[PDB]
């Protein structure tokens, strides 16, 4: 019920809720847009300052959000909102009643996958404008071709194609001609994550049993396989500063680091987030940088950094473990008590069921 | 002593900094304190990997390396988290010493494996794969005795 | 060599000099529109010079028993109940 004394202002103390956040890069700086229920929040990755909060609460929970240069694409119940500086610029209503639950943006195309395994392609009108706005076509992944769509990505240098990662298969669509170019062989366990490598035409797949596949999307083979037994894989990220490391993120809250060149395991950060709230939900390397931003469902967003190596001649074999850098956080459980600390309305004390006083 | 007097000491070799321009040699406990680091252990195992690759492992080096390794395991024998940090370093260098042709470096790896298995209870499958790697390149006679 | 050909890139035809990012992947000053497979190869070499090619992709694709068992295991001791007799030197004793 609308009120006549008090009007809603903000909901403070929230950093993440375990929607996989998006990173974006203006120039040479980075921002991190994390979902907090029905609003998102943009953070300055060099210092984790809150730049922006989305202007209005969406009518339902934001479920998939991405970020190109200036624009943030947030998918909630049916539709995709295109936001700049918090203020919404456009709203793309899909023609379905199915809930949109994945999206990618490449070229003039925004591609949004619903949960009835249909994919909606939207096109720019003229290639000089800012966001894809007009309806183009619809793609469908039927039960013959693949399972439920588990990720939707575009690995680079692929002229208007789309890698669709289903639960068992990897399809590759041409989104201008509406065609299914290539459907891979099946995978013997259900794949949960995907991340495109900075190696050319290679995607990395993460399964519900413990293995990372390095699929070569042009040969149709798999290049290598990394086995992490009894661990469901929830994140994949690649280091892109002349050190070929991979970072996998495990839903018991672990962040495991691999060297791909010499096939060893660099380090494991254990209990980086709570397993009960989802484990590590999104971990990503800021590219060109030795810092990786993780976020979990326990209302926490951290950064870890790799210091330069301690051996002055070897280096590549003596890899110093990742250390902690800045982080923001709030309560992981709903607060149980509230007080104002002073008469200026500046700080407020707040105690929660997770036994912390913030 | 001469190379320590004229050397400029790296940051991993930090405990030799009181034996530079000194008249007395570094002691064995200083050598174990040098080897007790983890980054130094990764550095020395890469050095041994290049030694084993270019086939330059000689028996005085294998004796010294094995002595310092089993003293590292002995020093860390009372903290399981340091032993567990230390297992995939020294078992990896045991695999890379067993994967060569020298009987001396093979029984050096035998010494490292026997001290490490009696220092902590390893897994059954790790012990079985260790005996598979032991038998998969067994060609000498003193190596057979140690094996 | 490749497991698919799509037959659309060959008959596409891109411009080059309309945006400053694609303005660098010309081989002449008279090129203005190029074919799609040529254009794909130009920005493939451009991707390769943004992110340089590592050695793990072309080096290898997938007595090593110990190395394999170490690369799969994460704990290295006996787990819970396959012990049946006490470990020495470190107890496990809670206070009630």
């Amino acid at each position: 019920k609308n009120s006549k004394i008090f009007s809603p202002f903000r909901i403070i103390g929230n950093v993440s809720n375990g929607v996989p956040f998006a990173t974006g890069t203006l120039g040479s700086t980075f921002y991190i847009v994390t979902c907090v229920g029905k609003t998102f929040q943009i953070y300055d990755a060099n210092t984790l300052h809150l730049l922006f909060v989305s202007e209005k609460e969406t009518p339902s929970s934001i479920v998939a959000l991405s970020a190109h240069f200036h624009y943030v694409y947030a998918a909630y119940e049916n539709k995709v909102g295109i936001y700049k500086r918090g203020i919404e610029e456009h709203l793309l209503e899909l023609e379905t009643d199915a809930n949109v639950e994945h999206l990618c943006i490449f070229g003039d195309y925004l591609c949004a996958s619903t949960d009835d395994n249909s994919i909606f392609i939207y096109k720019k009108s003229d290639p000089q404008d800012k966001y894809p706005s007009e309806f183009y076509t619809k793609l469908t992944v039927t039960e013959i071709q693949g399972g439920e769509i588990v990720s939707l990505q575009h690995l680079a240098t692929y002229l208007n194609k789309l890698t669709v990662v289903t639960k068992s298969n990897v399809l590759l669509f041409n989104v201008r001609t509406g065609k299914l170019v290539f459907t891979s062989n099946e995978f013997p366990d259900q794949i949960t994550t995907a991340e495109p490598a900075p190696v050319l035409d290679i995607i990395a797949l993460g399964t519900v049993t413990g293995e990372v596949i390095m699929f070569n999307m042009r040969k149709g083979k798999r290049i290598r396989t990394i086995k992490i037994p009894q661990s469901r894989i929830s994140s994949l990220s690649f280091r892109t500063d002349g050190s070929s490391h991979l970072s996998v993120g495990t839903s018991s809250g672990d962040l495991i680091f691999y060297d791909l060149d010499r096939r060893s395991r660099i380090h494991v950060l254990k209990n980086i987030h709570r397993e009960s709230y989802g484990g590590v939900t999104q971990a990503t390397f800021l590219n060109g940088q030795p810092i990786i931003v993780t976020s979990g469902g326990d209302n926490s967003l951290k950064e870890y950094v790799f210091d330069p190596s301690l051996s002055q001649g070897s280096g590549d074999v003596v890899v110093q473990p990742p250390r902690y850098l800045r982080s923001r956080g709030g309560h992981s459980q709903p607060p149980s008590y509230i007080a104002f600390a002073d008469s200026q309305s500046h700080f407020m004390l707040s105690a929660s069921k997770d036994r912390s006083l913030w | 002593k001469r190379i320590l007097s004229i050397i400029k000491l790296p940051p991993l070799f930090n405990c030799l900094s009181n034996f530079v321009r000194s008249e007395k040699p570094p002691t064995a406990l200083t050598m174990i304190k040098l080897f007790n680091d983890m980054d130094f252990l990764k550095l020395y195992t890469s050095y041994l990997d290049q030694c084993i690759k270019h086939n330059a492992t000689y028996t005085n080096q294998l004796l010294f390396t094995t002595c310092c390794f089993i003293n590292v395991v002995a020093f860390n024998s009372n903290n399981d988290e340091k032993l567990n940090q230390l297992v995939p370093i020294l078992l990896e260098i045991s695999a890379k010493l067993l994967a060569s042709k020298s009987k001396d470096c093979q029984i050096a790896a035998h010494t490292i494996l026997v001290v490490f298995a009696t220092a902590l209870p390893l897994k059954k499958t790790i012990i079985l794969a260790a005996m598979e790697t032991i038998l998969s390149n067994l060609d000498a006679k003193e190596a057979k005795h140690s094996a | 060599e490749a497991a698919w050909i799509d037959s659309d890139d060959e008959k596409i035809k891109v411009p080059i000099l309309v945006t400053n990012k694609t303005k660098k992947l010309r081989t002449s000053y008279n090129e203005s529109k190029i074919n799609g497979v040529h254009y794909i190869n130009r920005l493939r070499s451009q991707f390769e010079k943004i992110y340089p090619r590592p050695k793990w992709v072309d080096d290898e694709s997938d007595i090593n028993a110990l190395t394999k068992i170490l690369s799969t295991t994460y704990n290295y001791k006996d787990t819970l109940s396959n012990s049946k007799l006490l470990p020495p030197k470190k107890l496990d004793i809670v206070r009630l």
Partner: peptide, 28 residues
């Protein structure tokens, strides 16, 4: 003296990234 595990002050650097807006072509 043991080895010195001190942390450096980390500053970000200028990185180049492939943007995929050139990965979409129109037909005549």
């Amino acid at each position: 003296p043991k080895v010195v595990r001190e942390a450096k002050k980390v500053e970000m650097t200028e990185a180049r990234a492939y943007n995929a807006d050139a990965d979409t072509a129109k037909a005549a």
